[PDB]
Design a protein around this nucleic acid. Structure first.
Ligand code: GET
Lengths: 194, 171, 189, 106, 130, 199
RNA sequence: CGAUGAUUUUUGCCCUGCACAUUUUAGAUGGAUACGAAUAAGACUUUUUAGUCGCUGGACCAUAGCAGGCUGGCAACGGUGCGCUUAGCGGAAAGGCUUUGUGCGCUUGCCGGCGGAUAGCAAUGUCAACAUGCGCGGGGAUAAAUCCUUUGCAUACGACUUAG
RNA sequence: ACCGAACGUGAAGUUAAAGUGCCGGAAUGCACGCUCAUCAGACACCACAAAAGGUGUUAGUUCAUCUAAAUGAACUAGCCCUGAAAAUGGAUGGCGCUCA
RNA sequence: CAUCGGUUUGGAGCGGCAGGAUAAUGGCGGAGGAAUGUGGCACGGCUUCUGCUGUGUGUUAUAGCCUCUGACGAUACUGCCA
């Protein structure tokens, strides 16, 4: 028989499954749509939630009862020291979706971002990116060729950036590394900017 | 090849009162002679009050086409039974034999009227000697001056599953 | 019924050259060039002479034959639009609120702006099709002129103007306001 | 030369069967290039070898053979029925067989 | 000018020459309907046949009246030399060449292989000098 | 009708079910088949009607758990694959082996871009359908039900066609040169003897 | 499914040449032989008029030599196999399509000398690609993860975020 | 429980009913037509449909006005369309099929 | 592998014979007729008649067709061959 009275469903079916997230760093599922005529610019930034506070403000909404009157509002503070660019990734369009063609790294990586490639840093020999840095020493022609590849084939260019977590009061020493898509200009302009 | 045209001649069995019964002929379109005599008795039993047991078949003979390679237009008069009644109708066919036109008529009433063989009586098949005796336009359009027409979109029938050249339909 | 052959004759006037290849029809005349693609129809064309073209369907049934006269009429509209032009006239009908119609340009593209229709605050914009010219007539009060080489484009764009001005939630027998096609003819008579 | 073949290529298609019951004693064989019962009748009585490889060597060889023969045509598309000394195992549905040119009558 | 491209269909009409069974020639004598015609020729039997069982050729017997009898068709056919016109066409030459190839023995096929070797030697020599 | 190592079929202009039955019988008999340009496949009937049919397909889903239900693939090659799998005893090991002999693709990816493609006359739309009937292109149907890569495939197909036209121009030039060479060495003794043999 | 970092100072690991031997095979046994598009249309020549082609791949290429041996000549300066080298193009899954010179071979384009027997009248009568292992040989590099302690951005336990 | 046919253990041949695009042994076999459906249709028992409508298309019957170039009226019955609304997602057995 | 015997499935099988309207046709000879009328002729719109072309008249002419028939000769179809 029918429900004796009608009520809406409890909770949303669009946030299923209600499971633990795969990673603690929230990933950008989709980036802003690329506009070529705009200047080359980043589309995202990584910070750390520090806390909440209160503000007072004059409201500017004509027709509202609170127009040109003070409102008290809750606000959130995000600690955002500058990020360091350490690499670039090129993506190609395929009939199966975007596919990353190659990744080019900077010559020198700080200890905090290289701590990200370790589960037991203190017991390791710290070999991460130690043979890669030799690819710059001779004449950096391998790096130039990989970047030329990205210019020739990629349709989406994202930069690899990491936070400077040692500037935060956090006791964690691992930096958070993320891909931020580069929007604006041509693919060549994007690779140059990176 | 389905049908032949037969003549079937029969009479009543002679008796003392009637020693010389009249001979009756029918023109029957049948697959074989067994069906031909069966049709003869069917029609004689419907028209006259005669049964098979008191009669006899006198003659069964193939009637061949006089001009089997002359193009003709035939008129056919029919009585047939639909799902809801009994109807008469007249149609026209083009063929080189009477049997060919009759086979086409059987296919045609099967196709357009769902009329099975058992539901059709062939009243008469007539060769239309004059162009003015031809009434239906679906056959009249093939009797015009200097008739010619192409056959567009030729589909060639291949002997292999896979072809290494693009399909064509020219002709 | 499978008619053995059906024919239609295209009369192509003195100043036109109708070029046909693979059911792509290109009609050139003194007022310009018009093209129509007819790949969705099974027809064939014969040049009888410089002033006539034969259009034929072979072994066609009723509907296939019905398409033949349509093909001929469409190409004839191409010809009479490339030689005589097409001009549709629209009249503004209102009881109380005047309908204010202007030909504006935004994004470098021409529009027809209709304001104060039944006193509404909403502004109506109709994109002007390519090859169609709009022109507020001066001789007649409250009249719009829709002109162009293509009958299909001109009539469709006039219909776009007429449909955007429908009256809602009212007795349209009473509320007769709108912009209606009053005359359908040719640019040059 | 580059080629040394003296047999006609074939495939083990199926067993003789109805919709639900199969008969392993009769194999249906597709002869390459044969598309009618008229052309298939050339191969009736010819010998058929199914040649396969096995893990263990016999007389120093890992190659083993199952011999049969063509018995009659099948259907209208040039398939044939074949009779092997040992029924071909069903895993060979789709495998290649060899139709010999002998016993020859040319 | 108007320059419309017209079809180059072969027409079903009296005098059109057809192939029957890919082997023998015939000409259309009368049309029965859209599907069927009466055909006749010196090397066939006069018969009614479906258009789907024969192939139209680009050859037309000129000035053949509708419904012509066998004697008329044979006389017109001999006068027009239809066999000669057909035998000179690349279609008939291809049929004849396939028939020739299908009659070769094994030794003749060997001879074809060696002759093609010599042929290829000459052709490559010509190719480099080009 | 020869046994091939791989048969590569250009799916353009083929009717879905007829090609599916032919390919099913081919792979079941041990023949390897690749079908390319599945976005160019045809289905008889107007587009709206086949869209309604695919929506009727979409409506079917396991009620107690949608993740267990039938999985509705939207890409054209997966539409062909669904048609083919329904004609295979795919729940047997022999059926799985047969399906392992099949590959289906949107567009023409390498290495099949430089290989010979064939057609199947019994399944070709232009040869099968009556000239006036309406038909659907599977690429358009796939986009309307959620396939995301129509424009990507179109762009890559344009690029492939440019490259292939260049290939064909070179091949045609060499063919003309070789034909001239063969005609020059005609009226030769070997050539005449060959002509006597039908070659 | 992709990109990318590091890959053991162990006698372990990576790349590479040869030789030998094994295991595996949904099934080699001359070659998967590449325009695109239309189909009531394509192509070639003149000229937009017409003539020609197709009407299936029964095609094309390759194909002779102890499973293809040993030798010699003539004609052309061509064809072809393997190993080096140059340059370019290919990112849809490129991993292939090319091109420059170079070394050794073969050439059935034409004509020769020698050899095969006995596997007995057939018996797959054993000739493939893939992978692995073992001897030699030449180049090359020199890690981490988990447990444990710690944290609380996490947590029933596993798991997770941290630090050592 | 219907159709076919009744049964020892085998070989070869041929069939019955039912079938021959694939699932599946056997033809994308030959042929004349009809039908296009924004709920087509697809095989006895058997897994239903009615009264009633259609200027969708096809073939027929009987009248009438016609050169003092064909057309008008009533009607018959084939396929198609409307009439035709139920509860988990789903069944011409499935795929799929449109000069089938 | 050969030959035989039993059973059985085939071939583009080959040949002889009989029947029927002692096939019907076709081909040849003869008589008669007509039109979706050939040549000819008379009138025309587009043709320097460059299938141009349509309508007329009429009867083989610079094509043919239809009906009847006279003497031969075949073929199909069905059946038989110990
Ligand atoms: C010839 N007799 C017909 C008989 O064949 C059958 O006709 C159906 C007809 O009922 C169907 O039509 C009917 O049924 C379908 C559906 C339930 O299948 C409905 O969609 C449709 O609205 C309904 N009118 C039609 N689509 C096909 C005809 N053969 O139904 C009985 C009948 C009308 O007497």
């Amino acid at each position: 028989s029918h429900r004796k009275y009608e009520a809406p469903r409890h909770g949303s079916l669009g946030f299923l499954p209600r499971k633990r997230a795969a990673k603690q760093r929230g990933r950008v599922k989709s980036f802003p749509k690329d506009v070529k005529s705009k200047p080359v610019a980043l589309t995202a930034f990584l910070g750390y939630k520090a806390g909440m506070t209160t503000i007072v403000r004059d409201l500017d909404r004509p027709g509202s009862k609170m127009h040109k009157r003070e409102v008290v509002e809750a606000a959130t503070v995000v600690d955002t020291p500058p990020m360091v660019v350490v690499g670039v990734v090129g993506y190609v369009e395929t009939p199966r979706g975007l596919r990353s063609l190659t990744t080019v790294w900077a010559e020198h990586l700080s200890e905090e971002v290289r701590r990200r490639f370790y589960k037991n840093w203190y017991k390791s020999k710290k070999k991460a990116f130690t043979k890669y840095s030799g690819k710059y020493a001779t004449d950096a022609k391998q790096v130039e060729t990989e970047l030329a590849r990205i210019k020739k084939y990629a349709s989406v260019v994202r930069v690899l950036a990491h936070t400077q977590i040692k500037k935060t009061p956090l006791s964690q020493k691992k930096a958070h590394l993320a891909e931020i898509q580069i929007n604006g200009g041509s693919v060549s302009d994007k690779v140059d900017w990176a | 090849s389905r049908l032949n045209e037969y003549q079937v001649i029969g009479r009543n069995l002679p008796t003392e009162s009637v020693p010389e019964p009249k001979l009756f002929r029918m023109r029957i379109f049948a697959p074989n002679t067994v069906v031909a005599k069966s049709r003869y008795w069917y029609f004689l039993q419907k028209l006259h009050k005669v049964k098979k047991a008191s009669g006899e078949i006198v003659s069964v003979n193939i009637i061949s086409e006089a001009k089997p390679t002359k193009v003709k237009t035939f008129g056919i008069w029919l009585r047939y039974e639909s799902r809801s009644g009994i109807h008469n109708m007249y149609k026209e066919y083009r063929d080189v034999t009477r049997v060919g036109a009759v086979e086409t008529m059987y296919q045609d009433l099967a196709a357009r009227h769902r009329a099975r063989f058992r539901s059709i009586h062939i009243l008469k098949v007539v060769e239309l000697e004059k162009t003015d005796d031809v009434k239906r336009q679906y056959v009249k359009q093939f009797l015009t001056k200097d008739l010619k027409f192409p056959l567009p979109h030729r589909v060639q029938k291949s002997k292999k599953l896979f072809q290494a050249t693009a399909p064509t339909t020219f002709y | 019924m499978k008619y053995i052959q059906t024919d239609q004759i295209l009369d192509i006037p003195e100043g036109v050259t109708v070029d046909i290849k693979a059911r792509v029809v290109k009609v050139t005349g003194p007022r310009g060039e018009l093209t129509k693609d007819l790949k969705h129809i099974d027809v064939t064309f014969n040049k009888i002479n410089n002033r006539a073209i034969k259009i034929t369907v072979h072994n066609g049934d009723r509907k296939h034959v019905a398409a033949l006269r349509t093909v001929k009429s469409l190409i004839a509209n191409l010809i009479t639009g490339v030689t005589k032009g097409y001009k549709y006239k629209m009249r503004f009908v209102y009881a109380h609120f005047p309908i204010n119609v202007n030909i504006i340009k935004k994004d470098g593209q021409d529009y027809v702006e209709i304001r104060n229709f039944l006193g509404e605050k909403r502004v109506r914009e109709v994109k002007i099709h390519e090859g169609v010219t709009m022109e507020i007539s001066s001789t007649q009060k409250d009249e719009l002129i829709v002109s162009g080489n293509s009958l299909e484009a001109v009539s469709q764009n006039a219909a776009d103007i007429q449909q955007i001005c429908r009256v809602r939630n009212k007795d349209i027998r009473k509320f007769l306001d709108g912009i209606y096609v009053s005359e359908r003819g040719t640019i040059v008579e | 030369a580059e080629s040394h073949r003296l047999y006609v290529k074939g495939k083990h298609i199926s067993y003789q069967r109805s919709k639900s019951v199969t008969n392993p004693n009769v194999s249906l064989i597709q002869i390459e290039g044969v598309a009618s019962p008229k052309d298939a009748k050339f191969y009736l009585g010819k010998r058929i070898a199914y040649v396969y490889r096995a893990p263990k060597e016999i007389r120093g060889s890992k190659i083993r053979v199952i011999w049969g023969k063509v018995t009659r045509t099948h259907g209208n598309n040039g398939l044939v029925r074949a009779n092997f000394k040992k029924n071909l195992p069903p895993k060979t549905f789709g495998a290649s067989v060899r139709i010999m040119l002998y016993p020859s009558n040319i | 000018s108007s320059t419309v491209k017209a079809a180059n269909w072969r027409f079903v009409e009296v005098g059109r020459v057809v192939l029957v069974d890919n082997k023998e020639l015939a000409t259309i004598v009368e049309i029965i309907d859209q599907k069927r015609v009466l055909i006749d020729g010196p090397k066939i039997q006069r018969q009614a046949i479906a258009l789907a069982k024969i192939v139209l050729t680009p050859i037309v017997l000129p000035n053949l009246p509708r419904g012509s009898r066998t004697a008329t068709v044979t006389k017109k056919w001999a006068a027009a030399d239809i066999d000669a016109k057909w035998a000179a066409s690349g279609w008939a030459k291809k049929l004849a060449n396939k028939e020739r190839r299908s009659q070769l023995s094994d030794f003749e096929r060997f001879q074809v292989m060696v002759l093609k070797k010599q042929r290829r030697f000459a052709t490559k020599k010509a190719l480099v000098k080009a | 009708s020869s046994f091939e190592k791989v048969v590569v079929i250009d799916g353009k202009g083929h009717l879905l079910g007829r090609l599916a039955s032919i390919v099913s019988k081919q792979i079941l008999n041990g023949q390897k088949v690749v079908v390319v340009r599945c976005e160019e496949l045809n289905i008889s009937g107007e587009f709206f009607r086949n869209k309604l049919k695919y929506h009727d397909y979409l409506r079917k889903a396991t009620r107690y758990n949608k993740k267990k239900g039938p999985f509705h693939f939207r890409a054209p090659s997966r539409i062909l694959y669904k048609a083919i799998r329904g004609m295979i005893p795919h729940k047997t090991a022999r059926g799985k082996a047969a399906l392992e002999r099949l590959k289906v693709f949107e567009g023409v990816p390498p290495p099949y871009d430089k290989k010979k493609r064939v057609v199947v006359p019994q399944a070709l739309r232009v040869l099968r359908l009556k000239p006036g009937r309406k038909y659907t292109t599977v690429g358009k149907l796939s986009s309307a039900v959620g396939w995301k890569y129509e424009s990507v495939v179109e762009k890559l197909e344009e690029k492939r066609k440019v490259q292939s036209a260049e290939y064909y121009a070179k091949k045609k030039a060499l063919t003309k040169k070789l034909n001239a060479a063969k005609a020059s060495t005609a009226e030769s003794e070997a050539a005449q003897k060959l002509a006597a043999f039908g070659y």
